[PDB]
Design a protein around this ligand. Structure first.
Ligand SMILES: *[C@@H]1O[C@H](CO)[C@@H](O[C@@H]2O[C@H](CO)[C@@H](O[C@@H]3O[C@H](CO[C@H]4O[C@H](CO)[C@@H](O)[C@H](O)[C@@H]4O)[C@@H](O)[C@H](O[C@H]4O[C@H](CO)[C@@H](O)[C@H](O)[C@@H]4O[C@H]4O[C@H](CO)[C@@H](O)[C@H](O)[C@@H]4O)[C@@H]3O)[C@H](O)[C@H]2NC(C)=O)[C@H](O)[C@H]1NC(C)=O
Ligand SMILES: *[C@@H]1O[C@H](CO)[C@@H](O[C@@H]2O[C@H](CO)[C@@H](O[C@@H]3O[C@H](CO)[C@@H](O)[C@H](O[C@H]4O[C@H](CO)[C@@H](O)[C@H](O)[C@@H]4O)[C@@H]3O)[C@H](O)[C@H]2NC(C)=O)[C@H](O)[C@H]1NC(C)=O
Ligand SMILES: *[C@@H]1O[C@H](CO)[C@@H](O[C@@H]2O[C@H](CO)[C@@H](O[C@@H]3O[C@H](CO)[C@@H](O)[C@H](O)[C@@H]3O)[C@H](O)[C@H]2NC(C)=O)[C@H](O)[C@H]1NC(C)=O
Ligand SMILES: *[C@@H]1O[C@H](CO)[C@@H](O[C@@H]2O[C@H](CO)[C@@H](O[C@@H]3O[C@H](CO)[C@@H](O)[C@H](O)[C@@H]3O)[C@H](O)[C@H]2NC(C)=O)[C@H](O)[C@H]1NC(C)=O
Ligand SMILES: *[C@@H]1O[C@H](CO)[C@@H](O[C@@H]2O[C@H](CO)[C@@H](O[C@@H]3O[C@H](CO)[C@@H](O)[C@H](O)[C@@H]3O)[C@H](O)[C@H]2NC(C)=O)[C@H](O)[C@H]1NC(C)=O
Ligand SMILES: *[C@@H]1O[C@H](CO)[C@@H](O[C@@H]2O[C@H](CO)[C@@H](O[C@@H]3O[C@H](CO)[C@@H](O)[C@H](O)[C@@H]3O)[C@H](O)[C@H]2NC(C)=O)[C@H](O)[C@H]1NC(C)=O
Ligand SMILES: *[C@@H]1O[C@H](CO)[C@@H](O[C@@H]2O[C@H](CO)[C@@H](O[C@@H]3O[C@H](CO)[C@@H](O)[C@H](O)[C@@H]3O)[C@H](O)[C@H]2NC(C)=O)[C@H](O)[C@H]1NC(C)=O
Ligand SMILES: *[C@@H]1O[C@H](CO)[C@@H](O)[C@H](O)[C@H]1NC(C)=O
Ligand SMILES: *[C@@H]1O[C@H](CO)[C@@H](O)[C@H](O)[C@H]1NC(C)=O
Ligand SMILES: *[C@@H]1O[C@H](CO)[C@@H](O)[C@H](O)[C@H]1NC(C)=O
Ligand SMILES: *[C@@H]1O[C@H](CO)[C@@H](O)[C@H](O)[C@H]1NC(C)=O
Ligand SMILES: *[C@@H]1O[C@H](CO)[C@@H](O)[C@H](O)[C@H]1NC(C)=O
Ligand SMILES: *[C@@H]1O[C@H](CO)[C@@H](O)[C@H](O)[C@H]1NC(C)=O
Ligand SMILES: *[C@@H]1O[C@H](CO)[C@@H](O)[C@H](O)[C@H]1NC(C)=O
Ligand SMILES: *[C@@H]1O[C@H](CO)[C@@H](O)[C@H](O)[C@H]1NC(C)=O
Ligand SMILES: *[C@@H]1O[C@H](CO)[C@@H](O)[C@H](O)[C@H]1NC(C)=O
Ligand SMILES: *[C@@H]1O[C@H](CO)[C@@H](O)[C@H](O)[C@H]1NC(C)=O
Ligand SMILES: *[C@@H]1O[C@H](CO)[C@@H](O)[C@H](O)[C@H]1NC(C)=O
Ligand SMILES: *[C@@H]1O[C@H](CO)[C@@H](O)[C@H](O)[C@H]1NC(C)=O
Ligand SMILES: *[C@@H]1O[C@H](CO)[C@@H](O)[C@H](O)[C@H]1NC(C)=O
Ligand SMILES: *[C@@H]1O[C@H](CO)[C@@H](O)[C@H](O)[C@H]1NC(C)=O
Ligand SMILES: *[C@@H]1O[C@H](CO)[C@@H](O)[C@H](O)[C@H]1NC(C)=O
Ligand SMILES: *[C@@H]1O[C@H](CO)[C@@H](O)[C@H](O)[C@H]1NC(C)=O
Ligand SMILES: *[C@@H]1O[C@H](CO)[C@@H](O)[C@H](O)[C@H]1NC(C)=O
Ligand SMILES: *[C@@H]1O[C@H](CO)[C@@H](O)[C@H](O)[C@H]1NC(C)=O
Ligand SMILES: *[C@@H]1O[C@H](CO)[C@@H](O)[C@H](O)[C@H]1NC(C)=O
Ligand SMILES: *[C@@H]1O[C@H](CO)[C@@H](O)[C@H](O)[C@H]1NC(C)=O
Ligand SMILES: *[C@@H]1O[C@H](CO)[C@@H](O)[C@H](O)[C@H]1NC(C)=O
Ligand SMILES: *[C@@H]1O[C@H](CO)[C@@H](O)[C@H](O)[C@H]1NC(C)=O
Ligand SMILES: *[C@@H]1O[C@H](CO)[C@@H](O)[C@H](O)[C@H]1NC(C)=O
Lengths: 431, 121, 121, 121, 48, 40, 45, 37
């Protein structure tokens, strides 16, 4: 026929396009995660229900995580520069036994800067054995990271609690979320939906244990492209969250040193409570409850008590011991009992002030939190779990940063609109 | 219904979602720099799409009447049968590798009756 | 006369300042960052107001002919009597708490005759 | 042919390069800051030119039919003789020192029949 | 270039002096100029 | 006439490559007499 | 000046009035200080 | 800093093997390193 053409604008057509994401506070003086420059308004998102869409999601290839991975490093590293720095403090410390507070505490002397530039007074402050490293016989003791990179002090007013945030692309972009908990997303989602912006996601940092995560619908999901992959390994979503509690009831005082002009370096004062190391409290039957679930499902993907949980060989402290973050502290819990294939069991935990977690990932000064004057008594949930494949034996692992955030962005993808389209109709109304 | 509402709905009778797609296309520290490279992108995205509509003599109508007829090289698709059961996703994929030629052709034709308008009075 | 000229002038016969309001709407270190968050804001301010006009089928006319009639819930105002002595400031305040419905309703009608245009031929 | 193609071609019959000029007008660290004050300038350059066309009632047509006639103060140029051999760049130089009056005068006439449209019905 | 200073008429407009934020907007602006104009300059320390 | 090496000014080592380039601005606006009054 | 300097031995222990509180910076000599008039006005729209 | 800086003990011409009295990495205990210039 004498078929003409016409163009329809505003029609739904898609395309995958890497781009940037916004931040939404959804909510208080400062915070390491900004949450103040983020747009707070989320006026009743539509969460429009799409249907009959055979859309494919790729979870390894998705770059929302990679875009977010660089964002987090930027926030931490950029939130440290506009405040004091430890140096000059990593001079050799005339440092001896403790005169009684004990164990890691190694009451220690400085012999460093006065405040009036020149005089140099011999002040002192406590330190932990993990923080301090040997280079005299047993007095040559300095900081563990002064040999490698400059050290910066956490800025006291800056908080650390993981205030939830939301990510979403600007206008002209859409977010695809398929609402059905049976997807190890590498193929088609059917019940897809659009949301104006992402729901609550809490940027928490840990290793081998994901805390304060999504609420499971009484289902256990394991997502990995190749169950026999030689690289990255199993990622687990757990049962209804289990109440895990950790605390260090070691009430401390706060000491001011005035390391330099308008600097006011801080360090642990003393102990006036009871010598009780940090510990974590998990229920005794919960770990068996989740055990039987993953075990029964593991019999399908893997050959069917032949299941053995063994500790990692070692090589990196950031991986061997479980990493915690509550109340501004940074615990290091010996995870022997968690993965031994096993009242209120007690899990030992140590504390080290200086952490270089953000020095080996993007590169800048190592961080160390100042002591907190009050109690912690921090309680938290647990919804994720990480294991590695070597009868089949599972061991703790991870290491790579891009693991702790894959458990919450599996059901999200950035998509580009293509409103242009051509259709044939009748035409030639014009000249 | 709403932002990209009725995406999986009918092929041709789903025009009710045209207006809702158009309205939400633009109106809707570390983040601040990111916001600058998040809002300018949204602006030119709307203008780039509006650029094609404006030059073709079909600005702000949601229908773009033209004079260039169909060509055998695109495809053979019947009327009223392909227009009730077909995924609009696949339709664009069929023409994407050959979509770009139409934009130049229409403007070449659009300039023809543009000149004849003065001549025809 | 000029930028917002004749603001206090008549209600209906003060249309002479429509064009001057439109031209000035967009044409017109520490400050550099400020200027960046001062010029983009001006751009979208023009586009956001232009977005509503474009979708309603009255782009670039200064008059928006429509099909949706009046509703009793807005107000009872006579013709040629309310239109010669009333503060336009107060006029907007009356409907501002219910003006949001017009934008969606007009679009729901603007798309109707868009479809009928092809049908009526 | 292309970006500014046929610039040295005929005076009036070189309209074929009108559309190619319009499409390329917008679509197309140390330098990151430079890029920010390089694309916003590109955007407003298109809008500023588009502002004049939008208010004159000739948006997206490539012609602007008006009612204001010629004036003796511009120049005396014949038809079909000046329109086949003359540099367009030189043509603009002659009126550039008096071009500004046209923009205001046209809209004073554009707003005229805008009112009469409702009156004439 | 020669501002117009167009004159409105018959306008009953209320201005709030305490509540206006032009001063508050400008108050932070002045601090920014002063504090940001000193960083690209020599520092007295070490001299005290 | 004796020639000696010189220069000194930094705006010399790059003049030899941008002699045949010039930034220019477009002026798409123009006015043309025709027949009109198709509108009201 | 006596106002600038503050006492902390007997009468020579005299430092700057603000070294013990915050860092001290020097304005560059070229930077002027006269209050050149400025104007504040909002963008278009 | 002023370099306790002498002739070359062979490298020759413009090479002037030289000492520093540096500042060390432990922020104290200056060590007397050397290098060429
Ligand atoms: C998974 O999610 C859970 C739930 O949020 C989370 O547990 C929560 O941890 C946070 C810390 O990370 C806890 O919040 C802190 O709690 C204590 C005590 O506050 C409680 O008790 C007082 C008693 O009066 C109540 O008023 C109060 O509402 C709480 O119930 C405090 O240490 C903390 O307050 C300080 O931090 C705030 C945020 O930065 C500041 O706004 C506040 O001013 C306090 O700091 C100031 O005062 C201190 C006083 O000593 C001083 O030392 C500081 O220098 C500063 O001046 C804070 O409220 C929260 O209670 C936990 N929630 C529960 C239910 O236990 C898990 O941590 C999380 N998991 C992971 C891994 O992150
Ligand atoms: C870490 O080690 C350092 C170095 O040893 C240590 O610092 C010491 O603290 C004690 C705290 O008592 C200081 O001793 C005080 O010094 C003067 C002496 O004139 C007085 O203020 C005090 O005397 C009163 O208190 C005594 C009891 O403490 C009474 O016996 C006496 O009668 C007085 O009432 C007291 O002697 C001492 O000077 C410092 N030393 C240095 C070098 O700074 C610190 O306590 C250790 N920290 C921990 C946590 O163990
Ligand atoms: C958005 O852009 C990013 C890059 O800016 C895209 O991810 C990257 O995609 C490229 C291919 O386009 C990948 O390159 C290939 O990677 C490996 C390197 O060993 C190898 O296969 C090839 O030699 C090649 O270099 C790259 O790996 C990949 N990832 C990264 C981190 O760069 C991404 O696809 C884009 N996203 C979209 C279109 O949604
Ligand atoms: C901080 O560093 C200074 C560096 O001068 C240390 O000064 C040293 O103090 C010790 C005693 O604590 C002195 O030792 C004694 O000195 C004399 C002989 O010089 C004599 O009394 C004894 O035989 C003994 O050696 C030492 O001389 C003195 N100087 C040096 C260079 O070491 C100071 O002790 C340090 N303070 C802290 C808290 O570490
Ligand atoms: C800064 O200082 C630290 C602490 O001294 C340096 O650590 C060094 O680490 C290596 C590798 O582990 C040690 O070598 C050998 O390691 C094992 C475990 O002890 C064993 O084979 C030997 O006993 C030996 O220690 C090394 O001793 C250790 N210390 C030094 C002074 O080399 C770290 O490498 C230093 N960083 C930089 C950038 O210089
Ligand atoms: C595909 O995804 C959509 C969007 O999530 C699903 O619609 C959702 O269906 C559930 C179950 O009926 C609705 O939950 C109900 O909502 C209210 C309370 O909010 C109340 O009726 C019930 O107590 C229940 O919680 C949910 O509202 C609804 N979501 C939306 C946005 O309408 C749909 O079921 C999915 N389809 C399939 C086949 O899985
Ligand atoms: C780095 O600077 C130090 C500053 O103390 C220099 O130490 C100086 O070393 C020289 C020998 O190289 C010493 O000279 C000898 O000292 C004693 C008398 O004090 C005696 O043995 C001799 O009569 C001779 O004078 C000198 O005393 C010592 N101190 C000073 C203040 O000069 C060191 O040499 C410098 N290192 C380098 C590599 O330049
Ligand atoms: C496709 O799904 C839609 C809802 O999204 C439903 O109305 C329609 O009947 C479905 N079509 C088929 C062929 O299943
Ligand atoms: C003293 O320090 C040494 C060396 O670190 C340690 O082995 C010992 O246990 C400490 N003794 C006491 C009584 O604290
Ligand atoms: C949703 O998940 C259920 C439970 O596994 C499954 O039976 C159903 O087919 C899924 N529906 C989809 C993807 O539309
Ligand atoms: C998984 O990895 C193993 C080991 O490399 C390989 O043999 C196997 O083919 C992979 N599976 C798939 C489905 O590609
Ligand atoms: C832990 O999960 C439970 C599930 O019911 C929820 O009610 C609770 O708020 C969660 N706790 C936190 C701190 O998110
Ligand atoms: C810790 O000790 C300090 C000593 O001043 C006291 O003020 C504070 O209340 C104590 N914290 C407790 C009991 O949690
Ligand atoms: C952990 O603390 C929570 C909150 O107080 C409590 O409900 C729960 O019983 C505790 N866990 C155990 C194992 O007692
Ligand atoms: C863990 O592996 C080690 C060797 O790496 C072995 O000696 C040990 O018995 C294993 N433990 C368990 C509980 O399987
Ligand atoms: C954890 O404790 C076990 C004994 O319960 C011990 O063998 C192991 O070395 C400890 N691990 C660490 C990292 O301290
Ligand atoms: C765990 O059980 C012990 C039993 O002695 C009890 O004292 C303790 O409070 C319990 N922990 C909780 C409820 O968190
Ligand atoms: C289609 O396009 C081709 C390529 O430009 C052209 O030769 C041909 O005449 C056009 N028409 C038909 C009916 O193929
Ligand atoms: C056009 O496509 C139709 C599809 O039904 C087919 O029957 C016909 O043969 C095609 N024509 C040519 C020339 O390929
Ligand atoms: C669409 O439906 C018609 C009418 O039943 C049928 O002839 C045609 O084959 C269908 N097309 C597709 C692609 O299923
Ligand atoms: C690419 O163009 C070819 C013809 O050249 C066409 O057959 C194909 O469908 C297009 N799209 C692809 C390969 O995605
Ligand atoms: C006015 O709007 C209301 C609410 O939508 C509607 O029910 C009514 O029919 C409309 N018309 C009149 C005359 O009230
Ligand atoms: C509408 O308002 C007018 C104002 O003059 C009043 O006379 C009339 O009664 C009102 N109608 C209703 C139904 O309230
Ligand atoms: C406007 O003027 C008319 C005619 O004099 C008068 O009836 C009416 O009340 C006036 N309205 C107001 C609001 O003053
Ligand atoms: C606000 O809305 C109310 C009714 O909801 C209306 O009476 C009033 O005039 C509106 N405007 C105001 C209070 O400025
Ligand atoms: C030309 O413009 C002038 C100046 O505004 C005006 O007086 C005159 O009437 C216009 N017409 C002619 C034909 O000169
Ligand atoms: C207008 O210019 C033409 C150019 O040919 C000339 O002949 C004519 O005399 C001019 N008219 C006036 C009034 O200057
Ligand atoms: C243009 O050509 C015409 C016709 O030959 C001639 O009369 C006229 O003088 C020419 N104009 C110029 C400016 O050369
Ligand atoms: C400038 O204006 C004058 C008259 O004011 C005119 O003669 C001239 O052609 C214009 N253009 C120039 C000098 O480029
Ligand atoms: C409005 O102002 C004009 C002058 O701008 C004046 O002539 C007129 O009387 C004023 N109207 C009233 C009602 O005050």
């Amino acid at each position: 026929e004498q078929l003409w053409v016409t163009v329809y604008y505003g029609v739904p057509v898609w395309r995958e396009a890497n781009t940037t994401l916004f931040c939404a506070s959804d909510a208080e003086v400062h915070n390491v995660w900004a949450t103040h420059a983020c747009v707070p308004t989320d006026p009743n998102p539509q969460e429009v229900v799409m249907g009959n869409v055979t859309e494919d999601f790729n979870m390894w290839k998705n770059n929302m995580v990679e875009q977010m991975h660089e964002d987090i490093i930027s926030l931490w590293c950029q939130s440290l520069k506009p405040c004091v720095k430890l140096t000059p403090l990593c001079v050799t410390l005339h440092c001896t036994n403790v005169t009684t507070m004990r164990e890691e505490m190694k009451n220690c002397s400085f012999n460093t800067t006065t405040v009036i530039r020149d005089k140099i007074q011999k002040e002192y402050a406590l330190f932990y054995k993990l923080d301090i490293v040997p280079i005299n016989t047993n007095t040559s003791y300095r900081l563990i990271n002064c040999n490698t990179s400059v050290i910066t002090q956490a800025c006291p007013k800056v908080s650390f609690e993981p205030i939830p945030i939301h990510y979403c692309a600007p206008a002209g972009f859409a977010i695809l979320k398929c609402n059905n908990k049976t997807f190890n997303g590498k193929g088609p989602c059917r019940n897809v939906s659009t949301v104006q912006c992402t729901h609550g996601i809490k940027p928490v940092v840990s290793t081998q244990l994901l805390l304060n995560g999504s609420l499971a619908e009484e289902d256990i999901i394991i997502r990995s492209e190749n169950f026999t992959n030689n690289g990255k390994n199993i990622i687990v979503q757990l049962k209804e969250p289990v109440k895990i509690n950790c605390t260090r009831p070691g009430n401390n005082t706060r000491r001011s040193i005035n390391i330099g002009p308008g600097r006011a370096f801080y360090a642990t004062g003393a102990i006036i409570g009871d010598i009780r190391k940090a510990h974590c409290n998990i229920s005794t039957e919960q770990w068996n409850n989740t055990l039987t679930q993953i075990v029964d499902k593991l019999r399908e993907q893997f050959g069917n008590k032949t299941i053995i949980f063994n500790q990692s060989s070692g090589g990196d402290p950031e991986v061997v011991m479980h990493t915690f973050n509550c109340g501004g502290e940074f615990f290091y819990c010996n995870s022997t009992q968690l993965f031994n294939s096993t009242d209120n069991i007690t899990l030992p935990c140590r504390i080290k002030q200086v952490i270089n977690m953000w020095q080996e990932v993007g590169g800048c000064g190592a961080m160390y939190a100042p002591p907190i004057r009050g109690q912690i008594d921090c309680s938290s949930n647990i919804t994720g779990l990480i294991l590695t494949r070597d009868n089949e034996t599972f061991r703790p692992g991870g290491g790579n940063m891009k693991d702790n955030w894959r458990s919450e962005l599996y059901k999200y993808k950035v998509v580009k609109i293509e409103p242009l389209g051509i259709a044939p109709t009748r035409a030639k109304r014009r000249v | 219904l709403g932002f990209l509402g009725a995406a999986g709905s009918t092929m041709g009778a789903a025009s009710l979602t045209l207006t809702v797609q158009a309205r939400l296309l633009l109106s809707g520290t570390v983040w601040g720099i990111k916001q600058l490279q998040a809002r300018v992108l949204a602006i030119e995205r709307y203008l780039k799409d509006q650029q094609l509509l404006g030059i073709w003599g079909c600005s702000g109508k949601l229908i773009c009447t033209t004079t260039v007829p169909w060509n055998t090289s695109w495809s053979n698709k019947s009327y009223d049968y392909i227009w009730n059961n077909m995924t609009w996703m696949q339709w664009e994929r069929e023409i994407d590798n050959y979509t770009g030629f139409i934009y130049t052709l229409i403007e070449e034709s659009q300039n023809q009756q543009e000149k004849n308008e003065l001549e025809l009075l």
